[PDB]
Amino acid sequence: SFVKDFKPQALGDTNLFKPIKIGNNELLHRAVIPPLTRMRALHPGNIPNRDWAVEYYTQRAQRPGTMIITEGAFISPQAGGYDNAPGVWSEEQMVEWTKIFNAIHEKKSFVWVQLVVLGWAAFPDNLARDGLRYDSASDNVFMDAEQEAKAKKANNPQHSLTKDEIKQYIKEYVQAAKNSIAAGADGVEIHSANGYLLNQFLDPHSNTRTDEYGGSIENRARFTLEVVDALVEAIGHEKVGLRLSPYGVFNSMSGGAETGIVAQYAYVAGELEKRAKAGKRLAFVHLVEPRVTNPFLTEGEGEYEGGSNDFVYSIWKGPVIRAGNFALHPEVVREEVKDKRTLIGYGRFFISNPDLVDRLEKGLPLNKYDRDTFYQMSAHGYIDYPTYEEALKLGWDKK
Amino acid sequence: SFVKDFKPQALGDTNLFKPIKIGNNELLHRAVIPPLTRMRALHPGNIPNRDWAVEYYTQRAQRPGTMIITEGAFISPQAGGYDNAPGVWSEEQMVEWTKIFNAIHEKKSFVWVQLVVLGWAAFPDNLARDGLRYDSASDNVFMDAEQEAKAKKANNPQHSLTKDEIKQYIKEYVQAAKNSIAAGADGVEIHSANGYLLNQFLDPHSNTRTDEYGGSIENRARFTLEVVDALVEAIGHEKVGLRLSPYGVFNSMSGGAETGIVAQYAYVAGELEKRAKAGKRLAFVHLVEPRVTNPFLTEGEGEYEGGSNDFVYSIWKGPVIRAGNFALHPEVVREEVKDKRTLIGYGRFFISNPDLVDRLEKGLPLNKYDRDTFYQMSAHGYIDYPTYEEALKLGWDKK
Numbered sequence: 016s017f018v019k020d021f022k023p024q025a026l027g028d029t030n031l032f033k034p035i036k037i038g039n040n041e042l043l044h045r046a047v048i049p050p051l052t053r054m055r056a057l058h059p060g061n062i063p064n065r066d067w068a069v070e071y072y073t074q075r076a077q078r079p080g081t082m083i084i085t086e087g088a089f090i091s092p093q094a095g096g097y098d099n100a101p102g103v104w105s106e107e108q109m110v111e112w113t114k115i116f117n118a119i120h121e122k123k124s125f126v127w128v129q130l131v132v133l134g135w136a137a138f139p140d141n142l143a144r145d146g147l148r149y150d151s152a153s154d155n156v157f158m159d160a161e162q163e164a165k166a167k168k169a170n171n172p173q174h175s176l177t178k179d180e181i182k183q184y185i186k187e188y189v190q191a192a193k194n195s196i197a198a199g200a201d202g203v204e205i206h207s208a209n210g211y212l213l214n215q216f217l218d219p220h221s222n223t224r225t226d227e228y229g230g231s232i233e234n235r236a237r238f239t240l241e242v243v244d245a246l247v248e249a250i251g252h253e254k255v256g257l258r259l260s261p262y263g264v265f266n267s268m269s270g271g272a273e274t275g276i277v278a279q280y281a282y283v284a285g286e287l288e289k290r291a292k293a294g295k296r297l298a299f300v301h302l303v304e305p306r307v308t309n310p311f312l313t314e315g316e317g318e319y320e321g322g323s324n325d326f327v328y329s330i331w332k333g334p335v336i337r338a339g340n341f342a343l344h345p346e347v348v349r350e351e352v353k354d355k356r357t358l359i360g361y362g363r364f365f366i367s368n369p370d371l372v373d374r375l376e377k378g379l380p381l382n383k384y385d386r387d388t389f390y391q392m393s394a395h396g397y398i399d400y401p402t403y404e405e406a407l408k409l410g411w412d413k414k
Numbered sequence: 415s416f417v418k419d420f421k422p423q424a425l426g427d428t429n430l431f432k433p434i435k436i437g438n439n440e441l442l443h444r445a446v447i448p449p450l451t452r453m454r455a456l457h458p459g460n461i462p463n464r465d466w467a468v469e470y471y472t473q474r475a476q477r478p479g480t481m482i483i484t485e486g487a488f489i490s491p492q493a494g495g496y497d498n499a500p501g502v503w504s505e506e507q508m509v510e511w512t513k514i515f516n517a518i519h520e521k522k523s524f525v526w527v528q529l530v531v532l533g534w535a536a537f538p539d540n541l542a543r544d545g546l547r548y549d550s551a552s553d554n555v556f557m558d559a560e561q562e563a564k565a566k567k568a569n570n571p572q573h574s575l576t577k578d579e580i581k582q583y584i585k586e587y588v589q590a591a592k593n594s595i596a597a598g599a600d601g602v603e604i605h606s607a608n609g610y611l612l613n614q615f616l617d618p619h620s621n622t623r624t625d626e627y628g629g630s631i632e633n634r635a636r637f638t639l640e641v642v643d644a645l646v647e648a649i650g651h652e653k654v655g656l657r658l659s660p661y662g663v664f665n666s667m668s669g670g671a672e673t674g675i676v677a678q679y680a681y682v683a684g685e686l687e688k689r690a691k692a693g694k695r696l697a698f699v700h701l702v703e704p705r706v707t708n709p710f711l712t713e714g715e716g717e718y719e720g721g722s723n724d725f726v727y728s729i730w731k732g733p734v735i736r737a738g739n740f741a742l743h744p745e746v747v748r749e750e751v752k753d754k755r756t757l758i759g760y761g762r763f764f765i766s767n768p769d770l771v772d773r774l775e776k777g778l779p780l781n782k783y784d785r786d787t788f789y790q791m792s793a794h795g796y797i798d799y800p801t802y803e804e805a806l807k808l809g810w811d812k813k
């Protein structure tokens with residue numbers, strides 16, 4: 016059915032429908048698909064779903080000139096720990112990704128691979144089964160008691176990365192980025208958000224290190240910036256973006272309760288702008304808004320009202336993608352896109368509306384999503400959400 | 415005469431005219447007199463002007479419940495270097511300050527002493543004459559070529575402070591703060607703005623140190639925060655505020671051209687909020703706006719449009735005084751004071767309008783200022799600017 020109480024607004028008269036260039040890509044509008052893990056990849060080997068993934072992305076690529084950021088993709092086995100999320104390290108994986116990228120390009124849209132390392136959010140038992148470590152920045156603070164216990168039970172205690180192991184992850188980020196471009200992707204997004212490994216280094220709750228990778232703002236940002244620099248060198252700044260969630264609490268990050276949190280993220284933004292002014296500007300910075308501090312809470316819940324991401328704009332002068340509870344709030348989007356370098360990521364409602372962009376332009380009702388199938392090994396709740404026309408035929412304008 | 419093309423707005427219907435408590439003081443409105451050096455203090459001994467200073471402050475205290483921050487006052491001879499700016503270290507000085515504070519209190523207004531250390535902005539020849547060093551954070555970067563040359567000519571080269579000398583300044587800040595309170599002041603403002611010594615430590619252009627007082631965000635902020643902590647301990651957080659100018663370029667500070675500048679100031683704000691949450695909240699933070707990056711340029715000149723101070727509000731949760739080209743822009747003030755913890759400092763037009771607060775409430779014309787007498791050893795351009803009524807009697811409503 017359609018979302019019951021929603022009052023749509025046509026946004027076609029706003030900058031959401033003005034073209035913009037991101038990296039090498041001429042986008043025709045500024046509604047971006049942010050990275051959305053869907054758990055349809057198949058075990059063993061973290062293989063993109065051979066039955067449905069092409070169709071899923073094809074559907075969501077249907078509006079010409081749409082920027083799509085893929086579901087998070089693990090850069091290596093050690094970076095993973097979820098059996099049904101895909102990787103980008105193996106030939107068997109890239110065969111499937113190639114088909115996906117080709118399909119998106121056939122629809123005249125674009126695709127950026129999000130590169131992921133899980134750190135403490137991984138399942139320590141899956142990792143132990145596969146002979147892999149359970150990694151984080153530190154070894155004396157844990158995501159939650161359950162994760163700490165799963166780790167101990169698996170004889171796979173949380174491990175504070177050595178410098179050599181950080182270097183190994185950086186090598187894997189580089190090779191994953193290369194693999195992505197070679198298979199036909201338009202670029203990559205470095206995931207440094209939502210409490211995964213890089214965010215675990217950025218955040219002083221999760222990073223109690225006393226070496227050069229913790230204990231100060233500069234040190235906590237070191238790993239993220241080393242990945243940025245390694246990928247810029249490998250595939251070019253125009254093919255690299257970075258995702259950050261300054262106010263996020265998901266996966267036991269600090270959020271606004273940490274009084275140094277804005278400084279930590281302002282420092283990262285400043286270092287990106289420094290690189291930009293020196294000739295290597297990232298394609299974009301992608302921010303999760305304080306509107307959504309945890310993306311598994313219903314829209315309107317977990318909103319942090321004590322901070323804004325606007326500070327980033329005083330520092331970083333390139334494109335900014337903002338995501339978090341914008342589908343249900345065209346009135347907010349209307350104001351945000353008045354800034355001419357702002358794009359809007361629409362997550363959950365892109366799950367349920369393959370033709371979301373048309374609906375935003377034209378002020379059409381939105382399909383309700385079904386959170387129960389966000390993660391599921393099924394075509395149902397993945398490729399069977401209808402377009403607006405299909406929904407009319409099903410009688411949804413009267414259900 | 416009145417400012418010719420100005421279109422006043424009555425601001426009495428805004429929060430500018432709602433009472434607010436700052437430290438121990440119940441202000442009746444939120445128009446603050448920011449610190450304004452006037453150079454009427456007499457040599458030798460940096461003595462507040464025995465003829466005119468009481469009258470100057472009395473005039474500007476006339477609206478009941480006004481917060482006045484004094485002209486900058488040197489904490490010690492070594493902290494000074496301008497013969498006609500006052501100090502707060504000697505009995506002879508405090509005799510005069512006592513009269514000033516009494517007069518302000520008789521008008522039912524309040525007075526906060528701004529505590530100043532000049533660093534590289536001092537005149538090295540005055541300092542050499544008096545057997546004093548020419549100090550800054552570093553010794554290999556200079557304010558400008560003229561200052562570097564004056565220093566060499568005076569055989570008083572710019573000197574990078576030792577840790578012991580920093581500790582000595584902190585002792586002097588403490589004693590100056592005590593002197594101020596004992597003489598009757600309501601509080602003190604730590605000057606960490608406008609390119610004076612503390613700002614010289616904060617800014618990476620002027621601070622190339624490699625000890626614990628430079629080389630990182632935390633290190634560059636160390637001196638400012640040590641002064642904050644020393645004064646909070648000495649006279650209480652409710653009697654201490656801090657002034658910062660993130661985007662200032664006056665006295666060869668970096669401003670927005672330094673991509674790490676927001677991070678540097680976000681860190682300071684965060685550390686203040688941390689202290690506040692731990693039970694010691696400063697009375698206020700005072701910000702110079704990017705509206706005025708150099709206060710000796712005519713209003714509208716030297717505006718930096720590439721940054722905002724709004725970030726501070728995501729971090730620091732106490733009162734914020736904002737200053738910079740607000741007198742000529744009631745339309746901007748009207749929007750800013752919608753935030754209920756925002757006060758507005760009015761500098762240059764408080765020089766020329768002793769009854770500025772009435773004029774803001776009632777939407778009256780403003781007396782033009784005469785910049786030539788901003789710094790002058792005279793009552794003229796100091797205590798002879800008329801109130802609105804006096805100006806009407808002089809025929810200014812038709813001049």
Ligand SMILES: Cc1cc2nc3c(=O)[nH]c(=O)nc-3n(C[C@H](O)[C@H](O)[C@H](O)COP(=O)(O)O)c2cc1C
Pocket residue numbers: 049050051052053085086087129206208209258303307310311338339340341342360361362363364389390
């Ligand atoms: C099912 C689901 C999967 C997600 N997967 C990812 C992901 O792989 N990488 C990522 O950075 N964010 C991920 N997110 C966060 C979203 O990209 C987005 O920031 C968030 O859902 C808020 O936007 P929205 O309110 O428009 O959904 C996910 C969110 C959901 C609900």
Ligand SMILES: Cc1cc2nc3c(=O)[nH]c(=O)nc-3n(C[C@H](O)[C@H](O)[C@H](O)COP(=O)(O)O)c2cc1C
Pocket residue numbers: 448449450451452484485486528605607608657702706709710737738739740741759760761762763788789
């Ligand atoms: C003549 C003059 C003297 C000033 N003296 C000081 C001072 O002693 N301490 C300080 O922090 N700022 C000082 N300032 C800066 C002002 O406090 C204020 O930030 C600036 O003038 C911008 O506000 P305005 O546009 O309302 O004048 C001075 C400015 C002027 C023009």
Ligand SMILES: C=C(C)[C@@H]1CC=C(C)C(=O)C1
Pocket residue numbers: 052086087088097100131208209265310
């Ligand atoms: C498996 C992933 C790559 C994660 C899924 C859920 C969220 C919120 C991410 O940021 C990544």
Ligand SMILES: C=C(C)[C@@H]1CC=C(C)C(=O)C1
Pocket residue numbers: 451485486487496499530607608664709
């Ligand atoms: C002599 C002083 C205390 C200075 C005068 C001019 C400015 C802009 C200050 O900040 C302090």
Ligand SMILES: [Cl-]
Pocket residue numbers: 096097098099138141
């Ligand atoms: Cl799993």
Ligand SMILES: [Cl-]
Pocket residue numbers: 325328354
């Ligand atoms: Cl903005």
Ligand SMILES: [Cl-]
Pocket residue numbers: 495496497498537540
């Ligand atoms: Cl002088």
Ligand SMILES: [Cl-]
Pocket residue numbers: 724727753
């Ligand atoms: Cl604000």
Ligand code: NA
Pocket residue numbers: 066394
């Ligand atoms: Na099927």
Ligand code: NA
Pocket residue numbers: 390
């Ligand atoms: Na789950």
Ligand code: NA
Pocket residue numbers: 465793
């Ligand atoms: Na006289």
Ligand code: NA
Pocket residue numbers: 789
């Ligand atoms: Na002068």
